[PDB]
Write a protein that binds this ligand. Structure first.
Ligand SMILES: CC[C@H](C)[C@H]1O[C@]2(CC[C@@H]1C)C[C@@H]1C[C@@H](C/C=C(\C)[C@@H](O[C@H]3C[C@H](OC)[C@@H](O[C@H]4C[C@H](OC)[C@@H](O)[C@H](C)O4)[C@H](C)O3)[C@@H](C)/C=C/C=C3\CO[C@@H]4[C@H](O)C(C)=C[C@@H](C(=O)O1)[C@]34O)O2
Ligand SMILES: CC[C@H](C)[C@H]1O[C@]2(CC[C@@H]1C)C[C@@H]1C[C@@H](C/C=C(\C)[C@@H](O[C@H]3C[C@H](OC)[C@@H](O[C@H]4C[C@H](OC)[C@@H](O)[C@H](C)O4)[C@H](C)O3)[C@@H](C)/C=C/C=C3\CO[C@@H]4[C@H](O)C(C)=C[C@@H](C(=O)O1)[C@]34O)O2
Ligand SMILES: CC[C@H](C)[C@H]1O[C@]2(CC[C@@H]1C)C[C@@H]1C[C@@H](C/C=C(\C)[C@@H](O[C@H]3C[C@H](OC)[C@@H](O[C@H]4C[C@H](OC)[C@@H](O)[C@H](C)O4)[C@H](C)O3)[C@@H](C)/C=C/C=C3\CO[C@@H]4[C@H](O)C(C)=C[C@@H](C(=O)O1)[C@]34O)O2
Ligand SMILES: [Cl-]
Lengths: 199, 261, 195, 174, 200, 199, 87, 87
């Protein structure tokens, strides 16, 4: 079985540059050319470029010309990718995908790696700003900002920070006759706040 | 008529050095047909073989369209001498030697269809390298190939594709000019590769040659059995007449050597 | 420049035949586009299916097949399976680089369909004080995991629950002065809307 | 006419001093074209009766670019194929018994092309194979018989004969 | 002995397209090129085109360029002919005729097929309207063929002449003479067996 | 464009020598016309005779022979036979396609000539109710089977609306034919003519 | 575009017979790459061998610069037939 | 390497061979390949058969000293064959 194992996740400040690896095993490494694909939250999948292990040859997407530098270390069966002048836009998941053909370019994908998550951020710890939300069964909302029926949704990225809300459906007869509140903790900031949902 | 149509195409500004334009800026797509005439001199020592074929290339060059829809004009006009036309600079990557046939008039044909479709046909004799594997030498099968690709134009300018119907054809008198082998199978494939100068499109036809056995049966196997069997007829001579036994056993052994040599 | 288009999502039952399509903006998908199809299982598991001329990856099931139906690239799964439920990206080759599509979320039915329970929350007073107003349109209990929020906005990606009915939240961001409204969710048919 | 030789593997024009060509333009517009050409043609041979066989070799002539609507070949009406007097004398191993003049027009993928074909019939000379193969083999088999006249006690003599003639037989065939 | 057997007769509506076959046997199929000839009532014989089985190569009469599409299936030794955008004018008998030479074009015909009759008519199954012919019968506007006629329910069988049918209004029409007296018509395609007496 | 012309019909007795000719409209029939001759027996039986340069089909009797007499292609049957009675088409090759002739109907006389028995019927009042008129002209008992059908309406010869059937062998080895007219009959045979009219 | 860029370079006075100029009058530096395709017929008697290779030469000819910094133009233009260049 | 059956291309080097001649000092590169001759052939066609040939000359040490014809036949045939092989 073939396997492509990529390096672990990385966190780097803007302006810096880091290099992720893709160690190939289970096949003649020098026989198949490697692609690099970038999956970012903001857009779809992007094709960065490709490198031929045996040849050293490379071909980049005009877009990443100068942003990425594909290399290869035959001895260790590893493919590397340099990323220069890292910025906010470079924060994504970078996959490496092998080409299908044996010692020739087939233009079709075989195996991918598990992906490498690169985070390029320049913001320090910030306390979660909690703002309560409110309009049978009445649903109440709780909003965390810039950091039965218990529904916490995914966390977005607003202005270089995070933000998620929290639905909670309950019998209307328990509100406001009873105190509904939501706990908001944040280990990295050491701050826990409460916001009482009122009508 | 024809001479006038040709004149019209080249009287304007036309540059045979400039690649044909495309609607989306895409690469010029060159469809390829290949007709093998003869496959000969299959050298096992230098691992190469000769072969004469007819290359047939077909692409679109809107600049050359004269009739367009036509239907009032000739379907295609034969390109006469003295008119330059952009052509795919195709070469044969695994060719070690190559000749074009030029007896009398050169053996080429160029047609410029009304819509701008160009046909190109040329006879070419080749000497190609064909790495062979003799593990089962007496009873082996080799696979020899012809590679075709552009030299200067990369994947953005020119792309090869085998003709949709019967990309590889064989002349009827091919197997008869190939006495030592039997051309069992053929295949039509792509060998596009990524090099240091860029990514180049490439086709590859492959013939499969099965070595004829009748020769090795008669010149190797039969005579060796006949030789081993003779060494046995000395088991029936009296143990006292050893001179007879040695004479047999030794002559058959020596002969065995020579034969193998 | 050139852009690739796919169905946002498709639905099919085990055993049926579904077909995903890949559309080129510059024109019809031709052979020199080398239409590729990639599958993404949950947890970021990518694998190739079809590509190149008419070749396929090692192990790609026989039910998967490529073609050029009409004037766009197609991917036909004859005899859909449970595990076939994933996200399918198609990639077209334009001259010297690949361009991926939006991806199609193929769902192989397992549980009865469910309408999205929507609730639209106004911007609280603390935010108004901040001078920045935020709206929240929470979506719970829907299946399959495909919803389209329609109101600066920014909706989150579908994520299953404890009852296997994907959920999500929508955020329409404004300013306090602009604040001084309705969220409609279209889910596989009808359209639930609240003001 | 852009004529070429379909079954030609190699071909040269003679250009020693002035090129060996002649073109005449008769008053009525009739053109004569004459040119010396050396060829190496492929001739599939069939060796079923090898020692005593006959092969038939051909030269094919046809247009390359012009189809059947533009150019049509026809063998001259009288003596289309001629042989130089000193041809058979420069051909020691065979005997050029018969010749024929035919048409080989064919329908291809690029169109229908007119084509002529001359054919010579070569009979392999036997005198060589009589002297280098048949005679010496009989002379070899006959020797293996002279051991039937040696006393059955002197087997060394018999084996020496029978084995040497057998070995030699092998070599000869090789 | 060589044989070329073509497909059976066909009836198709205008605008449609059908394909007739020519199965060759008794010779090396791939060695001889096939011609297709069209024999229509309206005109003479027309040469449609030819195909070389071994080569795949084809060459059409400018006239049928786009109307016919010659193909060949080596495995089954069969030659096929497609006919597109069928119309009234395409109603004819299509023969296939082999070329004479062995692995080369000789431009001369050997063996033909028995022919394939193609009828292109948007016509509806119609019974015959019989009118009396006095100083004979007149089966008129009947489709599709054939139609059979007897005299006196079969009695008067001497001197009866049934003439070929004709396509006069897109519907066949024939008559039948003879040397009380009634003629019996029996159209099997619509089960119409009408009789008409012959009065002065 | 180019048109091929042949004798409408010819007659000959068993043993004699008949000659069919094929004429080109553009000029003299040359060798590059590859004059072909095809025979059609009754019931749609086609077979080739001569063609190409100077070759013939497998089995074509020795009595058949081709030539370029005068300036047109010829087909000479030396020693005509009974079975030789058929329709002969010649085809000329013009550049890239074949053009067939009208065909010549060769009759091998094994029966005494027989003049045609022409009968013309008046359009039954019956079919006049359909507001349509149809004149029938039955022709029977003639030999050889080659008649010309010309119509006339009040002196002037009919040019539109006429259709005649091809002669067909009846019971007594003689031929028959019919001819119709379309509204809302002289017959040429062997030379003489037979007229049947009506007011 | 390309055809125009080429035209611009040779419309001026350019001599393929003249060596490319240098900043310090130094020699033209030619960088060489070499790709062996096949090495065959290794003759021991005549002590020689055959070999087919791809020669790759690279030098600087300021006279041929069209895009210079470029970044608005194509990185390189393929030299078409009919344009002489010092080699 | 697959088109080179008789040898094994073990090592390659890239060097300079600039030299001073009578017409001047010329710059020069030199690539070098190192070819190791394949042994399997010489093992089977030379060494093995010669041992097999020498060993045969020994089996005459086991024939009675009275039957010398057998010994000479062996010793001489193996010697002659040895010659041919070397030739
Ligand atoms: C029979 C072999 C034993 C060892 C005998 O060998 C000897 C004497 C001692 C043994 C009794 C010596 C041997 C010849 C044979 C006699 C053989 C023939 C006269 C012919 O062949 C026979 C048998 C042959 O089928 C084996 C058969 O072909 C059939 C069947 C085949 O399928 C099995 C099929 O493929 C084929 C298409 O149709 C054939 C019709 O007829 C004759 C053809 C043999 C010629 C042999 C040779 C010619 O040049 C060779 C060379 O120069 C050499 C060094 C030795 C010769 C030899 O080897 O000489 C030699 O190889 O006798
Ligand atoms: C006679 C054959 C038996 C087997 C004898 O062979 C040996 C000794 C044992 C047997 C008794 C050995 C043999 C030679 C013969 C003796 C033959 C001659 C001295 C000459 O030839 C004779 C006969 C020959 O007619 C067969 C006759 O030509 C006539 C008749 C022919 O028509 C039948 C006709 O075509 C011809 C035009 O005019 C001729 C005038 O005169 C001499 C010519 C023979 C030479 C033989 C050879 C020369 O190189 C050959 C090769 O290097 C080899 C390996 C063996 C030699 C050989 O085979 O040597 C060899 O093939 O005796
Ligand atoms: C064993 C040698 C003595 C002298 C014997 O010789 C004879 C009889 C007398 C002695 C007992 C005769 C000899 C053959 C041998 C028997 C050998 C075999 C059947 C095979 O080989 C064996 C041994 C061989 O390893 C030496 C071994 O390969 C291994 C090990 C090697 O590493 C040491 C390694 O490189 C390799 C990759 O994997 C192999 C698998 O198996 C067979 C391959 C031998 C063929 C020999 C020959 C073929 O054509 C040659 C030529 O036509 C000739 C003139 C003589 C032949 C011969 O020489 O014939 C010949 O050279 O016996
Ligand atoms: Cl000896």
């Amino acid at each position: 079985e073939v396997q492509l194992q990529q390096s672990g996740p990385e966190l780097v400040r803007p302006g810096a540059s880091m290099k992720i690896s893709c160690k190939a095993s289970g096949y003649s490494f020098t026989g198949y050319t490697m692609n690099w694909v970038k999956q970012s939250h903001g857009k779809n999948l992007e094709w960065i470029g490709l490198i031929n292990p045996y040849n050293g040859g490379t071909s980049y997407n005009q877009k990443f010309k100068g942003k990425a530098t594909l290399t290869v270390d035959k001895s260790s069966s590893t493919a590397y990718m340099e990323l220069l002048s890292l910025t906010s836009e470079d924060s994504a998941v970078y996959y490496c995908a092998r080409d299908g053909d044996y010692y020739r370019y087939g233009r079709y994908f075989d195996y991918w790696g598990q992906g490498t998550t690169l985070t390029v951020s320049s913001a320090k710890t910030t306390p979660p700003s909690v703002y309560p939300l409110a309009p049978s069964m009445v649903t109440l909302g709780c909003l965390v900002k810039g950091y039965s029926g218990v529904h916490t949704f995914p966390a977005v990225l607003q202005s270089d920070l995070y933000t998620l809300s929290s639905s909670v459906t309950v019998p209307s007869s328990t509100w406001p006759s009873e105190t509904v509140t939501c706990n908001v903790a944040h280990p990295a900031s050491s701050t826990k706040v409460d916001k009482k949902i009122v009508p | 008529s024809d001479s006038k149509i040709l004149a019209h195409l080249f009287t304007s500004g036309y540059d045979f050095r400039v690649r044909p334009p495309t609607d989306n800026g895409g690469p010029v797509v060159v469809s390829v047909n290949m007709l093998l005439r003869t496959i000969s001199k299959i050298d096992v020592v230098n691992m190469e073989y000769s072969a004469q074929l007819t290359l047939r290339e077909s692409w679109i060059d809107k600049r050359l369209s004269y009739g367009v829809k036509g239907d009032g004009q000739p379907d295609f006009v034969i390109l006469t001498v003295g008119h330059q036309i952009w052509m795919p600079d195709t070469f044969f990557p695994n060719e070690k030697q190559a000749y074009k046939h030029t007896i009398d008039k050169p053996n080429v044909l160029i047609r410029i269809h009304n819509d701008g479709t160009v046909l190109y046909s040329v006879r070419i004799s080749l000497v190609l390298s064909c790495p062979m594997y003799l593990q089962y030498y007496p009873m082996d099968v080799q696979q020899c190939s012809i590679d075709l690709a552009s030299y200067a134009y990369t994947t953005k300018d020119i792309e090869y594709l085998w003709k949709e119907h019967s990309p590889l054809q064989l002349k009827v008198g091919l197997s008869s000019s190939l006495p030592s082998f039997q051309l069992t199978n053929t295949s039509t494939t792509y060998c596009t590769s990524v090099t240091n100068t860029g990514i180049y499109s490439c086709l590859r036809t492959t013939i499969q040659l099965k070595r004829e056995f009748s020769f090795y049966l008669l010149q190797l196997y039969i005579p060796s059995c006949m030789l081993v069997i003779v060494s046995w007829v000395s088991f029936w001579f009296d143990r006292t007449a050893i001179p007879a036994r040695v004479t047999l056993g030794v002559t058959t052994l020596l002969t065995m050597t020579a034969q193998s040599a | 420049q050139a852009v690739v288009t796919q169905e946002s999502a498709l639905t099919t039952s085990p055993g049926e035949t579904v077909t995903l399509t890949c559309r080129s903006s510059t024109g019809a998908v031709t052979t020199i586009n080398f239409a590729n199809w990639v599958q993404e299982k949950p947890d970021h598991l990518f694998t190739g299916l079809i590509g190149g001329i008419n070749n396929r990856a090692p192990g790609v099931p026989a039910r998967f097949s490529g073609s050029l139906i009409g004037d766009k690239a197609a991917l036909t799964i004859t005899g859909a399976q449970t595990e076939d439920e994933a996200i399918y990206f198609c990639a077209l080759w334009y001259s010297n680089h690949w361009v991926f599509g939006g991806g199609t979320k193929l769902t192989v039915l397992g549980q009865p369909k469910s309408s999205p329970s929507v609730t639209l929350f106004p911007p609280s007073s603390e935010e108004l004080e901040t001078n920045k107003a935020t709206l929240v349109c929470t979506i719970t209990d829907f299946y399959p995991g495909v919803v389209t929020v329609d109101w600066g906005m920014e909706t989150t990606q579908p994520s299953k629950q404890s009852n296997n009915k994907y959920m999500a939240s929508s955020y329409l961001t404004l300013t306090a002065r602009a604040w001084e409204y309705s969220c409609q969710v279209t889910h596989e048919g009808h359209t639930v809307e609240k003001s």
